[PDB]
Design an enzyme around this catalytic site. Structure first.
Site, PDB file in Angstrom:
ATOM      1  N   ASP A  34      35.963  -1.124  10.870  1.00  0.00           N
ATOM      2  CA  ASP A  34      36.910  -0.877  11.406  1.00  0.00           C
ATOM      3  C   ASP A  34      37.682  -0.542   9.562  1.00  0.00           C
ATOM      4  OD1 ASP A  34      39.387  -0.340  12.607  1.00  0.00           O
ATOM      5  OD2 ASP A  34      40.013  -2.304  12.698  1.00  0.00           O
ATOM      6  N   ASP A 219      40.238   6.010  11.923  1.00  0.00           N
ATOM      7  CA  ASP A 219      39.928   5.181  12.594  1.00  0.00           C
ATOM      8  C   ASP A 219      38.497   4.817  13.299  1.00  0.00           C
ATOM      9  OD1 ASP A 219      40.245   2.500  13.096  1.00  0.00           O
ATOM     10  OD2 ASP A 219      41.914   2.614  14.471  1.00  0.00           O
TER      11      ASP A 219
HETATM   12  N1  LIG Z   1      41.655  -0.388  14.708  1.00  0.00           N
HETATM   13  C1  LIG Z   1      41.702  -1.084  14.887  1.00  0.00           C
HETATM   14  N2  LIG Z   1      41.544  -2.445  14.786  1.00  0.00           N
HETATM   15  C2  LIG Z   1      41.637  -3.381  15.201  1.00  0.00           C
HETATM   16  C3  LIG Z   1      43.017  -2.547  16.739  1.00  0.00           C
HETATM   17  O1  LIG Z   1      42.601  -1.061  16.687  1.00  0.00           O
HETATM   18  C4  LIG Z   1      40.658  -3.895  16.624  1.00  0.00           C
HETATM   19  C5  LIG Z   1      39.787  -2.853  16.769  1.00  0.00           C
HETATM   20  C6  LIG Z   1      38.488  -3.758  18.079  1.00  0.00           C
HETATM   21  C7  LIG Z   1      38.245  -2.717  19.147  1.00  0.00           C
HETATM   22  C8  LIG Z   1      38.526  -2.803  19.793  1.00  0.00           C
HETATM   23  C9  LIG Z   1      37.078  -2.336  21.163  1.00  0.00           C
HETATM   24  C10 LIG Z   1      36.218  -1.346  20.901  1.00  0.00           C
HETATM   25  N3  LIG Z   1      36.645  -1.347  19.103  1.00  0.00           N
HETATM   26  C11 LIG Z   1      37.161  -1.818  18.331  1.00  0.00           C
HETATM   27  F1  LIG Z   1      38.027  -1.495  16.946  1.00  0.00           F
HETATM   28  C12 LIG Z   1      38.572  -4.837  18.442  1.00  0.00           C
HETATM   29  C13 LIG Z   1      39.165  -5.869  17.551  1.00  0.00           C
HETATM   30  C14 LIG Z   1      40.106  -5.405  17.065  1.00  0.00           C
HETATM   31  O2  LIG Z   1      40.932  -6.174  15.777  1.00  0.00           O
HETATM   32  C15 LIG Z   1      42.291  -5.820  14.997  1.00  0.00           C
HETATM   33  C16 LIG Z   1      42.590  -6.894  14.438  1.00  0.00           C
HETATM   34  N4  LIG Z   1      43.154  -5.837  12.998  1.00  0.00           N
HETATM   35  C17 LIG Z   1      44.150  -5.360  12.839  1.00  0.00           C
HETATM   36  C18 LIG Z   1      44.862  -5.153  11.895  1.00  0.00           C
HETATM   37  C19 LIG Z   1      45.836  -6.226  11.279  1.00  0.00           C
HETATM   38  C20 LIG Z   1      47.064  -5.791  10.760  1.00  0.00           C
HETATM   39  N5  LIG Z   1      46.602  -4.357  10.300  1.00  0.00           N
HETATM   40  C21 LIG Z   1      46.075  -3.036  10.866  1.00  0.00           C
HETATM   41  F2  LIG Z   1      46.638  -2.436  10.095  1.00  0.00           F
HETATM   42  C22 LIG Z   1      45.272  -3.474  11.772  1.00  0.00           C
HETATM   43  C23 LIG Z   1      43.757  -4.156  14.044  1.00  0.00           C
HETATM   44  C24 LIG Z   1      42.385  -3.984  14.761  1.00  0.00           C
END
Ligand SMILES: NC1=N[C@@]2(CO1)c1cc(-c3cccnc3F)ccc1Oc1cnc(-c3ccnc(F)c3)cc12
EC number: 3.4.23.46
Length: 363
Positions: A34, A219
């Protein structure tokens, strides 16, 4: 870097993961890659969706930081317990580093039912780490403790998906043509500046601040190309016009429904990015093969945003992307694995003359 090629796996729409180990003896976990977050956080309890989880009780090298972390984000939340342990990447460099690990002990809508990953690797900068910027991100620890060069690169290839994360370098076999670099505007997200947008070579003609309101980021953790409302409005309008040979419902353009069957009636989308030199830019161009996603039925994978432009998998699967942290820049090159047809291919081209590119950034 041959050992790192094809080190990413995934399922369509559930992200790309890399194999990692944590603890001593090493516990293997699959970890979501990520570039839009900055914590290393792993399942640490038997959630029913998990194949496996981090068992701190089995690790002689685990150290408790005796501090909790609470992380709501836009589409879910996780909470956990901060510690450090030894971390390695089996299909990465031959090193082991002591990294911060958040042991996830409660969550909601974070883990995906049916997915094959158990944690998240936030590759962005300390400024957006939780609880604060004192919690050193994994990649920072990796570079501080080893001789691994301060860059990584991603080839996301797009049902089971595949790709490569090259840690500490670039594999020239993974792209064609030249890399073109855009500056990392600020080290928090991988923030960049889009200076022009075309649909089938037709300028949207918006004030370029709109393209980056309130930011534009690269991203790997977002599936779609996400655009700010006003720009999404204008882009759908032009894409609607470009594809008027066939008609589709208003819901389709809003993601609310699918369409089934046709590539050539759909227009290419070009983003011009700020170049390395004053008044110089370059452009990246993707195909409908990138923004019409299989679910032959398809989903419109461009969507509106209130958090700025997000160059997610829809953009990244067109390109080999180099996160050149050492020089505060991101490189794009045509990906050797991107999907295309006999008529059109994704492209990276330059140089172009673009004035007032500093005015395109939002303050
Ligand atoms: N870029 C991005 N990362 C995600 C949301 O968007 C995230 C994405 C996913 C996800 C879902 C489906 C497909 N691809 C993915 F990466 C899953 C969990 C997840 O869990 C996350 C957890 N925390 C963050 C987060 C927390 C604090 N500050 C930030 F800038 C981001 C972001 C995410």
């Amino acid at each position: 870097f041959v050992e790192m090629v094809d080190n990413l796996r995934g399922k369509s729409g559930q992200g790309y993961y890399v194999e990692m180990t944590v603890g001593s003896p090493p516990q293997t976990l699959n970890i979501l890659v990520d570039t839009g977050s900055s914590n290393f956080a792993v399942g640490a309890a038997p959630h029913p969706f998990l194949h496996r989880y981090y068992q701190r009780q089995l690790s002689s090298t685990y150290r408790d930081l005796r501090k909790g972390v609470y992380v709501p984000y836009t589409q879910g939340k996780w909470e956990g317990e901060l510690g450090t342990d030894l971390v390695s990447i089996p299909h990465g460099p031959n090193v082991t580093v002591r990294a911060n690990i958040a042991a996830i002990t409660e969550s909601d809508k974070f883990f995906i039912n049916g997915s094959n990953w158990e944690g998240i690797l936030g590759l962005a900068y300390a400024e957006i780490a939780r609880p604060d910027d004192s919690l050193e991100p994994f990649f920072d620890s990796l570079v501080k403790q080893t001789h691994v060069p301060n860059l990584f690169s991603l080839q996301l290839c797009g049902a089971s998906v595949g790709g490569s994360m090259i840690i500490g370098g670039i594999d020239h076999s993974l792209y064609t043509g030249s890399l073109w670099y855009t500056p990392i505007r600020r080290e928090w997200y991988y923030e960049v500046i889009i200076v022009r947008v075309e649909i089938n070579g037709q300028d949207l003609k918006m004030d370029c601040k709109e393209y980056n309101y309130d930011k534009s980021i690269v991203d790997s953790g977002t599936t779609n190309l996400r655009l700010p409302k006003k720009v999404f409005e204008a882009a759908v309008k032009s894409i609607k016009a470009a594809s008027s040979t066939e008609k589709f419902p208003d819901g389709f353009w809003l993601g609310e429904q699918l369409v089934c069957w046709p590539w050539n009636i759909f227009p290419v989308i070009s983003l011009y990015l700020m170049g390395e030199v004053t008044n110089q830019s370059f452009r990246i161009t993707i195909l409908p093969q990138q923004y019409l996603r299989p679910v032959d039925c398809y989903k419109f994978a461009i969507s509106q945003s209130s958090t700025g432009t997000v160059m997610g998998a829809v953009i990244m699967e067109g390109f080999y992307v180099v996160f050149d942290r050492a020089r505060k820049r991101i490189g794009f090159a045509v990906s050797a694995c991107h999907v295309h047809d006999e008529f059109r291919t994704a492209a990276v081209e330059g140089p172009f003359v673009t004035l007032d590119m500093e005015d395109c950034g939002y303050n």
